[PDB]
Amino acid sequence: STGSATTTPIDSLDDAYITPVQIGTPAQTLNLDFDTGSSDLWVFSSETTASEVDGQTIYTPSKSTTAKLLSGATWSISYGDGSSSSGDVYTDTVSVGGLTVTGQAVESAKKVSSSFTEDSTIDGLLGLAFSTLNTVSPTQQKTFFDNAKASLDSPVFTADLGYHAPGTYNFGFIDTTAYTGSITYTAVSTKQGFWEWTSTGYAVGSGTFKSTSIDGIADTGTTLLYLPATVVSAYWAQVSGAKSSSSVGGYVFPCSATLPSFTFGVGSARIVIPGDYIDFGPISTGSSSCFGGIQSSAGIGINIFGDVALKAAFVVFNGATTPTLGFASK
Numbered sequence: 001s002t003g004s005a006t007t008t009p010i011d012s013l014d015d016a017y018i019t020p021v022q023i024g025t026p027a028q029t030l031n032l033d034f035d036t037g038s039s040d041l042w043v044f045s046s047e048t049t050a051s052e053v054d055g056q057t058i059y060t061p062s063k064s065t066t067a068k069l070l071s072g073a074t075w076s077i078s079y080g081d082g083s084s085s086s087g088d089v090y091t092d093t094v095s096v097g098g099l100t101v102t103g104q105a106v107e108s109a110k111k112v113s114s115s116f117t118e119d120s121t122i123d124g125l126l127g128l129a130f131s132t133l134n135t136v137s138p139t140q141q142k143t144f145f146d147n148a149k150a151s152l153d154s155p156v157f158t159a160d161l162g163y164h165a166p167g168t169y170n171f172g173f174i175d176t177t178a179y180t181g182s183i184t185y186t187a188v189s190t191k192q193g194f195w196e197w198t199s200t201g202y203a204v205g206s207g208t209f210k211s212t213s214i215d216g217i218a219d220t221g222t223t224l225l226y227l228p229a230t231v232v233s234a235y236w237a238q239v240s241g242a243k244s245s246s247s248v249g250g251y252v253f254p255c256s257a258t259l260p261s262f263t264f265g266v267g268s269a270r271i272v273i274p275g276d277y278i279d280f281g282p283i284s285t286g287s288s289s290c291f292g293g294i295q296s297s298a299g300i301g302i303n304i305f306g307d308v309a310l311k312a313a314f315v316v317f318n319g320a321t322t323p324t325l326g327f328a329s330k
């Protein structure tokens with residue numbers, strides 16, 4: 001089997017991407033944030049605290065003839081931004097772009113933190129990291145990808161995120177028309193449950209390439225590119241007036257600036273992030289200070305190749321017995 005679904009930015013900044021997901025019988029379509037940095041499929045639901053729902057579409061298991069309560073199973077998760085959610089668990093039929101998994105654990109939120117309530121466009125998350133990170137207790141549950149793997153034509157999914165434009169998640173096949181050149185595959189460590197890999201270095205703008213190992217995770221659920229402070233300082237030093245602002249919480253730059261590109265290494269290959277992809281717009285409406293898309297990872301403990309990096313590439317999440325990551329230019 002295969003599946004293919006379009007993913008769409010939630011706003012003009014590409015803060016996150018939503019993909020329609022069919023849950024239950026008859027189908028209830030929710031727009032979920034596909035997150036390769038976590039491993040829970042959770043949704044706003046009829047059980048979510050009413051004061052914590054503000055415009056989201058909810059999953060109602062009582063209206064699904066295929067829903068079954070997963071008795072005694074609960075879940076509780078926290079993300080890098082301090083957001084959180086928790087609730088009960090059902091199993092139900094879940095379809096993405098024509099690919100159907102029966103008996104998928106669908107984690108129904110009883111509580112969500114404020115950042116989820118405030119984002120009326122995201123109805124939940126669909127985790128695509130390794131199932132060892134799934135938070136369901138006492139019986140840990142498999143991700144949608146893990147459950148689908150045996151049925152897929154090939155045990156892979158691909159992320160082709162757009163720049164201020166829709167893109168595509170494909171399951172079970174590699175669309176050889178979607179990228180230029182070849183896909184360079186690189187080793188993955190699953191020891192922390194992430195799609196964790198090692199970039200071979202970087203360049204800023206037209207500068208020469210600096211060969212250096214940068215361990216990090218491929219995370220479609222993180223907006224920005226978080227890299228070591230040395231690398232990030234070398235990037236922003238090329239932008240007149242750029243500086244790290246403790247009040248804003250990161251590097252800012254004059255909105256009048258045109259930004260240099262940023263290149264990261266994948267083996268001997270190179271992915272070039274155009275400078276415009278690094279511009280996240282005014283810090284507040286009307287401000288002439290703009291927020292940078294490359295930020296320091298020093299406070300988080302891990303480097304994150306988030307959407308800023310991944311949207312410059314066609315990215316293969318290869319879930320073969322020895323998982324690997326592939327990157328192609330596009």
Ligand SMILES: C#CCN(C)Cc1nc(C2(O)CCNCC2)cs1
Nearest residue numbers: 035037038079080219221222300302
């Ligand atoms: C701060 C800090 C330390 N870590 C929690 C930082 C991290 N946060 C994550 C994510 O939550 C980011 C969003 N997508 C899912 C994974 C992975 S590592």
